[PDB]
Design a protein around this nucleic acid. Sequence first.
DNA 1: CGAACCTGGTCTTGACTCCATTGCCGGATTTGTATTAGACTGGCAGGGTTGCCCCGAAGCGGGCG
Length: 88
Amino acid sequence: TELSERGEKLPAAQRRDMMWICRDGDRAKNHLLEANLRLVVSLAKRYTGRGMAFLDLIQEGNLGLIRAVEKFDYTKGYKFSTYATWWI
DNA sequence: CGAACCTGGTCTTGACTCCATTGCCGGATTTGTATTAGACTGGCAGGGTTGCCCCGAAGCGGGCG
């Protein structure tokens, strides 16, 4: 982003492997989301019985999980599920 | 027949005054968003009844040998 202005000229190998890292991060993000979808279902399974549909509850839990993997930190050394349960 | 008057709408002006129209400001309340770090990771209406249409075995008769 700070390179897209006239910050620096683009070397070929540096450009292509920084593109590889930038594309790899999104695949890792999607991998984490696709991992914890089951936790989302296991949390949403008990808020039924009033008003909304079960798939709607699951989808809003998915959106909360996207927010949780946005604002998740690992240097506190805790498991992901205890942090994401709150946001879901 | 001429003058004075009474009272008809007719109309101006000066003063009062009163209430809507913004307008600001301070506060109260009301609505909307972000954040909570132990670990937790795949459910439940539901069937039953009645009636009608579409494809598959099967005789089977005609073409085939």
